[PDB]
């Protein structure tokens, strides 16, 4: 399986255009690993039904 | 949520609501020989002829989750909104560092329930340890007088009509 | 705007609704003081009203943005009309069908 390492970004941070995930441009994977030390250093956002868009 | 915890520990916090007449009630809900209102909530009305923008901050410096209960008042017509609030169109916004919820007040007629033709919608907001609760509104705001501790246990609820022996 | 779908795969667009902290931020960024975002298709319709309210201090700023998505089928046309607080998408994603999922973990990769 193609494992992707979300060190500095989550899945939603790569979809919105956070500047800390510039290396994930047009990157495909099989399983996204979200770290517990992930944070946002940009304009803050809110996702209503957070499990709806991430799935 | 409360049935999973199984507690009613109502810790009265130091809420600061200035420029707003507190302890509002109605003639239908009575407490003793006089009138009454909700003991766990604070019905906010206008202060004379001026209702400014309210702004409170509730930090969470404890080691347990907080649960606040706030309401949105729904008047029966436009005459009840102008008599209780200065602004004819309010908006209730309760948000935290991780969530955001806004409930718009809906002016409409209600059926005759317990003599009154008005109701109030109830929406909750769970505050995590480390978060700050910011409640800003311009009308139809019901302020909480405290919170509850979100305990973790094996409690639940059950509807029954059997006596207790 | 109009976005036709003449391809053979599903499209996924990401649009946002801006939420200013007060009335001064709305008038400084937009002309109309009360906007409305409406994103609808031939089979669905979703409208999100912008909510002006104060936010806690997150990363120095006291404003946030709500995120709502709209999946466009092949043969549908995406129409996005708004009068304020509209965030425009710059593209889309291909809704591929596979056995992929997500997993929260803190273990290193070997």
mmCIF file of C-alpha atoms in Angstrom:
data_model
loop_
_atom_site.group_PDB
_atom_site.id
_atom_site.type_symbol
_atom_site.label_atom_id
_atom_site.label_comp_id
_atom_site.label_asym_id
_atom_site.label_seq_id
_atom_site.Cartn_x
_atom_site.Cartn_y
_atom_site.Cartn_z
ATOM 1 C CA UNK A 1 0.000 0.000 0.000
ATOM 2 C CA UNK A 2 1.158 3.524 -0.853
ATOM 3 C CA UNK A 3 1.367 5.170 2.573
ATOM 4 C CA UNK A 4 1.384 8.975 2.669
ATOM 5 C CA UNK A 5 2.923 10.810 5.633
ATOM 6 C CA UNK A 6 0.933 13.833 6.786
ATOM 7 C CA UNK A 7 3.596 15.323 9.058
ATOM 8 C CA UNK A 8 2.833 19.048 8.785
ATOM 9 C CA UNK A 9 -0.701 18.846 7.346
ATOM 10 C CA UNK A 10 -3.903 16.858 7.727
ATOM 11 C CA UNK A 11 -6.138 15.735 4.860
ATOM 12 C CA UNK A 12 -8.267 18.897 5.026
ATOM 13 C CA UNK A 13 -5.147 21.098 5.095
ATOM 14 C CA UNK A 14 -3.959 19.615 1.791
ATOM 15 C CA UNK A 15 -7.382 20.132 0.192
ATOM 16 C CA UNK A 16 -7.775 23.797 1.172
ATOM 17 C CA UNK A 17 -4.296 25.000 0.203
ATOM 18 C CA UNK A 18 -2.272 25.340 3.389
ATOM 19 C CA UNK A 19 1.298 26.544 2.645
ATOM 20 C CA UNK A 20 2.871 23.782 4.781
ATOM 21 C CA UNK A 21 1.780 21.079 2.303
ATOM 22 C CA UNK A 22 3.272 22.405 -0.940
ATOM 23 C CA UNK A 23 5.060 19.085 -1.603
ATOM 24 C CA UNK A 24 1.728 17.239 -1.999
ATOM 25 C CA UNK A 25 0.919 18.803 -5.388
ATOM 26 C CA UNK A 26 -0.991 16.218 -7.493
ATOM 27 C CA UNK A 27 0.047 13.408 -5.137
ATOM 28 C CA UNK A 28 -1.871 10.123 -5.087
ATOM 29 C CA UNK A 29 -1.821 7.609 -2.246
ATOM 30 C CA UNK A 30 -3.619 4.643 -0.699
ATOM 31 C CA UNK A 31 -3.725 5.534 3.020
ATOM 32 C CA UNK A 32 -3.275 8.958 4.617
ATOM 33 C CA UNK A 33 -1.623 9.011 8.049
ATOM 34 C CA UNK A 34 -2.607 12.047 10.131
ATOM 35 C CA UNK A 35 -0.235 12.796 12.999
ATOM 36 C CA UNK A 36 -1.376 13.966 16.424
ATOM 37 C CA UNK A 37 1.100 16.884 16.398
ATOM 38 C CA UNK A 38 -0.433 18.408 13.254
ATOM 39 C CA UNK A 39 -1.418 22.073 13.381
ATOM 40 C CA UNK A 40 -2.537 24.926 11.138
ATOM 41 C CA UNK A 41 -0.372 28.021 10.590
ATOM 42 C CA UNK A 42 -2.643 29.889 8.182
ATOM 43 C CA UNK A 43 -6.146 31.375 8.038
ATOM 44 C CA UNK A 44 -8.367 29.341 10.401
ATOM 45 C CA UNK A 45 -11.275 27.362 8.990
ATOM 46 C CA UNK A 46 -14.280 25.453 10.306
ATOM 47 C CA UNK A 47 -15.668 22.266 8.771
ATOM 48 C CA UNK A 48 -19.287 21.475 9.686
ATOM 49 C CA UNK A 49 -19.760 17.693 9.457
ATOM 50 C CA UNK A 50 -16.010 17.057 9.587
ATOM 51 C CA UNK A 51 -16.467 13.307 9.051
ATOM 52 C CA UNK A 52 -18.532 13.959 5.899
ATOM 53 C CA UNK A 53 -15.913 15.689 3.742
ATOM 54 C CA UNK A 54 -12.911 13.750 5.059
ATOM 55 C CA UNK A 55 -14.489 10.399 4.118
ATOM 56 C CA UNK B 1 -24.976 13.467 26.926
ATOM 57 C CA UNK B 2 -26.015 14.221 30.517
ATOM 58 C CA UNK B 3 -27.506 10.737 30.925
ATOM 59 C CA UNK B 4 -24.134 9.235 29.972
ATOM 60 C CA UNK B 5 -22.449 11.238 32.745
ATOM 61 C CA UNK B 6 -25.227 11.160 35.341
ATOM 62 C CA UNK B 7 -24.653 14.379 37.275
ATOM 63 C CA UNK B 8 -26.248 17.786 37.857
ATOM 64 C CA UNK B 9 -23.261 19.642 39.327
ATOM 65 C CA UNK B 10 -24.237 23.208 38.397
ATOM 66 C CA UNK B 11 -21.100 25.227 39.154
ATOM 67 C CA UNK B 12 -22.191 28.876 39.047
ATOM 68 C CA UNK B 13 -19.464 30.788 37.210
ATOM 69 C CA UNK B 14 -18.765 34.510 37.275
ATOM 70 C CA UNK B 15 -20.667 35.617 34.188
ATOM 71 C CA UNK B 16 -20.507 39.340 33.382
ATOM 72 C CA UNK B 17 -23.575 40.670 31.536
ATOM 73 C CA UNK B 18 -23.625 44.474 31.745
ATOM 74 C CA UNK B 19 -26.232 46.772 30.240
ATOM 75 C CA UNK B 20 -28.902 44.054 30.130
ATOM 76 C CA UNK B 21 -31.824 43.430 32.486
ATOM 77 C CA UNK B 22 -31.459 39.914 33.900
ATOM 78 C CA UNK B 23 -33.839 37.472 35.657
ATOM 79 C CA UNK B 24 -36.646 37.939 33.150
ATOM 80 C CA UNK B 25 -39.769 35.828 33.417
ATOM 81 C CA UNK B 26 -43.450 35.443 32.543
ATOM 82 C CA UNK B 27 -46.770 35.256 34.370
ATOM 83 C CA UNK B 28 -47.491 31.670 33.279
ATOM 84 C CA UNK B 29 -44.422 30.119 34.945
ATOM 85 C CA UNK B 30 -44.709 30.852 38.671
ATOM 86 C CA UNK B 31 -42.507 30.052 41.681
ATOM 87 C CA UNK B 32 -44.597 30.318 44.835
ATOM 88 C CA UNK B 33 -46.988 33.229 45.390
ATOM 89 C CA UNK B 34 -45.220 35.347 42.774
ATOM 90 C CA UNK B 35 -43.929 34.777 39.265
ATOM 91 C CA UNK B 36 -40.914 32.704 38.282
ATOM 92 C CA UNK B 37 -38.522 31.718 35.518
ATOM 93 C CA UNK B 38 -35.809 29.179 34.717
ATOM 94 C CA UNK B 39 -33.338 28.557 37.530
ATOM 95 C CA UNK B 40 -30.571 27.124 35.322
ATOM 96 C CA UNK B 41 -30.925 29.799 32.610
ATOM 97 C CA UNK B 42 -31.023 33.606 32.553
ATOM 98 C CA UNK B 43 -33.623 35.156 30.237
ATOM 99 C CA UNK B 44 -32.055 38.365 28.924
ATOM 100 C CA UNK B 45 -34.323 41.312 28.101
ATOM 101 C CA UNK B 46 -33.693 44.931 27.147
ATOM 102 C CA UNK B 47 -32.265 47.441 29.631
ATOM 103 C CA UNK B 48 -34.645 50.372 29.281
ATOM 104 C CA UNK B 49 -34.317 51.564 25.682
ATOM 105 C CA UNK B 50 -30.747 50.425 24.907
ATOM 106 C CA UNK B 51 -29.550 46.876 24.151
ATOM 107 C CA UNK B 52 -25.836 46.929 23.240
ATOM 108 C CA UNK B 53 -23.763 44.105 21.779
ATOM 109 C CA UNK B 54 -22.922 41.520 24.438
ATOM 110 C CA UNK B 55 -19.449 39.978 24.644
ATOM 111 C CA UNK B 56 -18.386 37.386 27.227
ATOM 112 C CA UNK B 57 -15.319 35.166 27.570
ATOM 113 C CA UNK B 58 -15.292 31.819 29.408
ATOM 114 C CA UNK B 59 -11.797 30.302 29.689
ATOM 115 C CA UNK B 60 -11.343 26.615 30.508
ATOM 116 C CA UNK B 61 -8.339 26.233 32.827
ATOM 117 C CA UNK B 62 -9.611 23.026 34.464
ATOM 118 C CA UNK B 63 -9.019 19.330 33.718
ATOM 119 C CA UNK B 64 -12.572 18.367 32.725
ATOM 120 C CA UNK B 65 -14.986 19.076 29.891
ATOM 121 C CA UNK B 66 -17.644 21.771 30.267
ATOM 122 C CA UNK B 67 -21.225 21.722 28.980
ATOM 123 C CA UNK B 68 -23.136 24.991 28.587
ATOM 124 C CA UNK B 69 -26.869 25.345 27.908
ATOM 125 C CA UNK B 70 -27.997 28.377 25.903
ATOM 126 C CA UNK B 71 -31.342 29.144 24.308
ATOM 127 C CA UNK B 72 -32.756 31.167 21.431
ATOM 128 C CA UNK B 73 -36.066 32.897 22.119
ATOM 129 C CA UNK B 74 -38.798 32.701 19.466
ATOM 130 C CA UNK B 75 -41.506 35.367 19.883
ATOM 131 C CA UNK B 76 -45.043 34.927 18.605
ATOM 132 C CA UNK B 77 -45.081 38.117 16.503
ATOM 133 C CA UNK B 78 -43.201 41.347 15.838
ATOM 134 C CA UNK B 79 -44.804 43.075 18.840
ATOM 135 C CA UNK B 80 -43.199 40.667 21.325
ATOM 136 C CA UNK B 81 -39.743 41.164 19.785
ATOM 137 C CA UNK B 82 -39.852 44.967 20.053
ATOM 138 C CA UNK B 83 -41.269 44.836 23.595
ATOM 139 C CA UNK B 84 -38.517 42.534 24.908
ATOM 140 C CA UNK B 85 -35.597 43.651 22.711
ATOM 141 C CA UNK B 86 -34.572 46.948 21.142
ATOM 142 C CA UNK B 87 -33.345 45.493 17.842
ATOM 143 C CA UNK B 88 -36.139 43.928 15.791
ATOM 144 C CA UNK B 89 -33.822 41.334 14.176
ATOM 145 C CA UNK B 90 -31.374 39.511 16.439
ATOM 146 C CA UNK B 91 -28.816 36.779 15.823
ATOM 147 C CA UNK B 92 -27.324 34.303 18.309
ATOM 148 C CA UNK B 93 -23.748 33.149 17.660
ATOM 149 C CA UNK B 94 -21.983 30.736 20.033
ATOM 150 C CA UNK B 95 -18.556 29.583 18.859
ATOM 151 C CA UNK B 96 -15.372 28.077 20.284
ATOM 152 C CA UNK B 97 -11.800 27.533 19.065
ATOM 153 C CA UNK B 98 -12.784 24.259 17.346
ATOM 154 C CA UNK B 99 -16.468 24.744 16.456
ATOM 155 C CA UNK B 100 -18.899 27.438 15.341
ATOM 156 C CA UNK B 101 -22.698 27.382 15.530
ATOM 157 C CA UNK B 102 -25.125 30.198 14.701
ATOM 158 C CA UNK B 103 -28.887 29.958 15.260
ATOM 159 C CA UNK B 104 -31.125 32.563 13.615
ATOM 160 C CA UNK B 105 -34.253 33.544 15.597
ATOM 161 C CA UNK B 106 -37.455 32.629 13.757
ATOM 162 C CA UNK B 107 -40.471 34.857 14.405
ATOM 163 C CA UNK B 108 -43.613 32.775 13.968
ATOM 164 C CA UNK B 109 -46.901 31.786 15.534
ATOM 165 C CA UNK B 110 -47.015 28.824 17.916
ATOM 166 C CA UNK B 111 -49.955 26.699 19.094
ATOM 167 C CA UNK B 112 -51.427 27.279 22.541
ATOM 168 C CA UNK B 113 -49.126 25.320 24.871
ATOM 169 C CA UNK B 114 -49.696 25.976 28.611
ATOM 170 C CA UNK B 115 -51.476 29.249 27.830
ATOM 171 C CA UNK B 116 -48.562 30.832 25.946
ATOM 172 C CA UNK B 117 -48.031 30.957 22.179
ATOM 173 C CA UNK B 118 -44.226 31.252 22.159
ATOM 174 C CA UNK B 119 -41.351 28.779 22.416
ATOM 175 C CA UNK B 120 -37.555 28.688 22.743
ATOM 176 C CA UNK B 121 -35.065 26.552 20.818
ATOM 177 C CA UNK B 122 -32.307 24.849 22.820
ATOM 178 C CA UNK B 123 -28.795 24.314 21.436
ATOM 179 C CA UNK B 124 -25.719 23.201 23.370
ATOM 180 C CA UNK B 125 -21.985 23.829 23.035
ATOM 181 C CA UNK B 126 -19.333 21.598 24.614
ATOM 182 C CA UNK B 127 -16.178 23.452 25.686
ATOM 183 C CA UNK B 128 -12.910 21.511 25.802
ATOM 184 C CA UNK B 129 -10.191 22.118 28.425
ATOM 185 C CA UNK B 130 -8.010 24.842 26.934
ATOM 186 C CA UNK B 131 -10.795 26.421 24.865
ATOM 187 C CA UNK B 132 -12.442 29.810 25.423
ATOM 188 C CA UNK B 133 -16.205 30.201 24.998
ATOM 189 C CA UNK B 134 -17.220 33.428 23.232
ATOM 190 C CA UNK B 135 -20.953 34.195 23.153
ATOM 191 C CA UNK B 136 -21.879 37.311 21.163
ATOM 192 C CA UNK B 137 -25.466 38.092 20.194
ATOM 193 C CA UNK B 138 -27.667 41.049 19.270
ATOM 194 C CA UNK B 139 -31.028 39.664 20.393
ATOM 195 C CA UNK B 140 -33.007 36.611 21.535
ATOM 196 C CA UNK B 141 -30.063 35.493 23.686
ATOM 197 C CA UNK B 142 -30.542 33.330 26.785
ATOM 198 C CA UNK B 143 -27.486 33.349 29.037
ATOM 199 C CA UNK B 144 -26.336 30.303 31.023
ATOM 200 C CA UNK B 145 -25.785 30.557 34.764
ATOM 201 C CA UNK B 146 -23.265 27.721 34.950
ATOM 202 C CA UNK B 147 -22.113 24.453 33.434
ATOM 203 C CA UNK B 148 -21.922 20.711 34.076
ATOM 204 C CA UNK B 149 -19.036 18.258 34.377
ATOM 205 C CA UNK B 150 -18.886 15.735 31.518
ATOM 206 C CA UNK B 151 -18.079 12.669 33.592
ATOM 207 C CA UNK B 152 -17.187 9.345 31.972
ATOM 208 C CA UNK B 153 -19.160 6.388 33.267
ATOM 209 C CA UNK B 154 -21.542 3.547 32.465
ATOM 210 C CA UNK B 155 -24.705 5.600 33.043
ATOM 211 C CA UNK B 156 -27.691 5.874 30.701
ATOM 212 C CA UNK B 157 -31.399 6.766 30.636
ATOM 213 C CA UNK B 158 -34.517 4.588 30.620
ATOM 214 C CA UNK B 159 -38.205 5.426 30.219
ATOM 215 C CA UNK B 160 -40.283 3.410 32.679
ATOM 216 C CA UNK B 161 -43.484 3.548 34.723
ATOM 217 C CA UNK B 162 -42.667 0.937 37.387
ATOM 218 C CA UNK B 163 -42.379 1.966 41.063
ATOM 219 C CA UNK B 164 -39.126 1.804 43.009
ATOM 220 C CA UNK B 165 -38.722 -0.836 45.724
ATOM 221 C CA UNK C 1 -20.464 31.127 -13.413
ATOM 222 C CA UNK C 2 -21.325 27.922 -15.270
ATOM 223 C CA UNK C 3 -19.292 24.699 -15.018
ATOM 224 C CA UNK C 4 -20.460 22.004 -17.460
ATOM 225 C CA UNK C 5 -19.497 18.359 -16.954
ATOM 226 C CA UNK C 6 -18.799 16.736 -20.334
ATOM 227 C CA UNK C 7 -16.393 14.125 -18.927
ATOM 228 C CA UNK C 8 -16.882 10.536 -17.725
ATOM 229 C CA UNK C 9 -16.007 11.026 -14.047
ATOM 230 C CA UNK C 10 -17.484 12.762 -11.018
ATOM 231 C CA UNK C 11 -16.231 16.202 -9.987
ATOM 232 C CA UNK C 12 -15.676 17.535 -6.465
ATOM 233 C CA UNK C 13 -15.527 21.302 -5.932
ATOM 234 C CA UNK C 14 -14.452 23.018 -2.704
ATOM 235 C CA UNK C 15 -16.059 26.369 -1.881
ATOM 236 C CA UNK C 16 -16.065 28.402 1.310
ATOM 237 C CA UNK C 17 -18.216 30.978 3.075
ATOM 238 C CA UNK C 18 -16.300 33.752 4.823
ATOM 239 C CA UNK C 19 -17.353 34.732 8.353
ATOM 240 C CA UNK C 20 -16.081 38.178 9.417
ATOM 241 C CA UNK C 21 -15.549 39.102 13.050
ATOM 242 C CA UNK C 22 -17.726 42.239 12.963
ATOM 243 C CA UNK C 23 -19.556 44.604 10.624
ATOM 244 C CA UNK C 24 -16.382 46.602 9.918
ATOM 245 C CA UNK C 25 -14.643 43.615 8.305
ATOM 246 C CA UNK C 26 -17.638 42.933 6.038
ATOM 247 C CA UNK C 27 -17.791 46.491 4.677
ATOM 248 C CA UNK C 28 -14.005 46.667 4.223
ATOM 249 C CA UNK C 29 -13.850 43.458 2.154
ATOM 250 C CA UNK C 30 -17.272 43.541 0.453
ATOM 251 C CA UNK C 31 -19.549 46.303 -0.801
ATOM 252 C CA UNK C 32 -22.845 44.725 0.271
ATOM 253 C CA UNK C 33 -23.158 44.417 4.049
ATOM 254 C CA UNK C 34 -25.336 41.267 3.846
ATOM 255 C CA UNK C 35 -24.254 38.547 1.424
ATOM 256 C CA UNK C 36 -25.601 35.096 0.603
ATOM 257 C CA UNK C 37 -23.806 32.114 -0.951
ATOM 258 C CA UNK C 38 -25.893 29.776 -3.124
ATOM 259 C CA UNK C 39 -24.347 26.723 -4.817
ATOM 260 C CA UNK C 40 -26.860 24.519 -6.628
ATOM 261 C CA UNK C 41 -26.887 21.857 -9.340
ATOM 262 C CA UNK C 42 -29.516 20.108 -11.478
ATOM 263 C CA UNK C 43 -30.161 17.520 -8.735
ATOM 264 C CA UNK C 44 -29.237 19.349 -5.510
ATOM 265 C CA UNK C 45 -29.443 22.812 -3.971
ATOM 266 C CA UNK C 46 -27.530 24.151 -0.969
ATOM 267 C CA UNK C 47 -27.508 27.698 0.420
ATOM 268 C CA UNK C 48 -25.293 28.805 3.318
ATOM 269 C CA UNK C 49 -25.984 32.178 4.945
ATOM 270 C CA UNK C 50 -22.907 34.068 6.222
ATOM 271 C CA UNK C 51 -22.990 34.557 9.993
ATOM 272 C CA UNK C 52 -21.272 37.675 11.339
ATOM 273 C CA UNK C 53 -19.967 36.894 14.816
ATOM 274 C CA UNK C 54 -16.964 37.087 17.092
ATOM 275 C CA UNK C 55 -14.473 34.212 17.117
ATOM 276 C CA UNK C 56 -11.815 33.286 19.692
ATOM 277 C CA UNK C 57 -8.174 34.142 19.062
ATOM 278 C CA UNK C 58 -6.940 31.331 16.796
ATOM 279 C CA UNK C 59 -3.490 31.887 15.203
ATOM 280 C CA UNK C 60 -3.700 35.632 15.853
ATOM 281 C CA UNK C 61 -6.932 36.203 13.911
ATOM 282 C CA UNK C 62 -10.516 36.298 15.189
ATOM 283 C CA UNK C 63 -12.308 35.183 12.009
ATOM 284 C CA UNK C 64 -13.088 31.832 10.396
ATOM 285 C CA UNK C 65 -14.561 30.332 7.217
ATOM 286 C CA UNK C 66 -17.150 27.568 6.864
ATOM 287 C CA UNK C 67 -16.420 24.861 4.284
ATOM 288 C CA UNK C 68 -19.165 23.146 2.270
ATOM 289 C CA UNK C 69 -18.731 20.895 -0.760
ATOM 290 C CA UNK C 70 -20.800 20.113 -3.853
ATOM 291 C CA UNK C 71 -20.344 16.960 -5.940
ATOM 292 C CA UNK C 72 -21.072 17.464 -9.650
ATOM 293 C CA UNK C 73 -22.251 14.472 -11.677
ATOM 294 C CA UNK C 74 -21.318 13.905 -15.344
ATOM 295 C CA UNK C 75 -24.003 15.725 -17.315
ATOM 296 C CA UNK C 76 -24.712 18.333 -14.626
ATOM 297 C CA UNK C 77 -23.831 22.038 -14.716
ATOM 298 C CA UNK C 78 -22.511 23.803 -11.612
ATOM 299 C CA UNK C 79 -23.981 27.286 -11.094
ATOM 300 C CA UNK C 80 -22.469 29.382 -8.291
ATOM 301 C CA UNK C 81 -24.160 32.753 -7.735
ATOM 302 C CA UNK C 82 -23.481 34.852 -4.645
ATOM 303 C CA UNK C 83 -23.677 38.458 -3.459
ATOM 304 C CA UNK C 84 -20.936 38.361 -0.823
ATOM 305 C CA UNK C 85 -18.631 36.195 1.307
ATOM 306 C CA UNK C 86 -17.974 33.910 -1.673
ATOM 307 C CA UNK C 87 -14.768 31.875 -1.974
ATOM 308 C CA UNK C 88 -14.192 30.662 -5.520
ATOM 309 C CA UNK C 89 -12.681 27.254 -6.324
ATOM 310 C CA UNK C 90 -9.652 27.040 -8.592
ATOM 311 C CA UNK C 91 -10.273 23.464 -9.716
ATOM 312 C CA UNK C 92 -11.737 20.098 -8.804
ATOM 313 C CA UNK C 93 -10.805 16.511 -7.959
ATOM 314 C CA UNK C 94 -11.566 13.186 -9.631
ATOM 315 C CA UNK C 95 -13.840 10.961 -7.522
ATOM 316 C CA UNK C 96 -12.029 7.683 -8.091
ATOM 317 C CA UNK C 97 -13.466 4.384 -6.857
ATOM 318 C CA UNK C 98 -11.062 2.277 -4.834
ATOM 319 C CA UNK C 99 -10.327 0.556 -1.534
ATOM 320 C CA UNK C 100 -8.603 3.567 0.050
ATOM 321 C CA UNK C 101 -9.344 5.035 3.481
ATOM 322 C CA UNK C 102 -7.835 7.218 6.223
ATOM 323 C CA UNK C 103 -6.106 6.343 9.496
ATOM 324 C CA UNK C 104 -4.890 8.504 12.382
ATOM 325 C CA UNK C 105 -1.521 7.255 13.617
ATOM 326 C CA UNK C 106 1.724 8.432 15.205
ATOM 327 C CA UNK C 107 4.021 5.547 14.209
ATOM 328 C CA UNK C 108 6.998 6.157 11.883
ATOM 329 C CA UNK C 109 7.203 4.688 8.390
ATOM 330 C CA UNK C 110 9.750 1.943 7.693
#
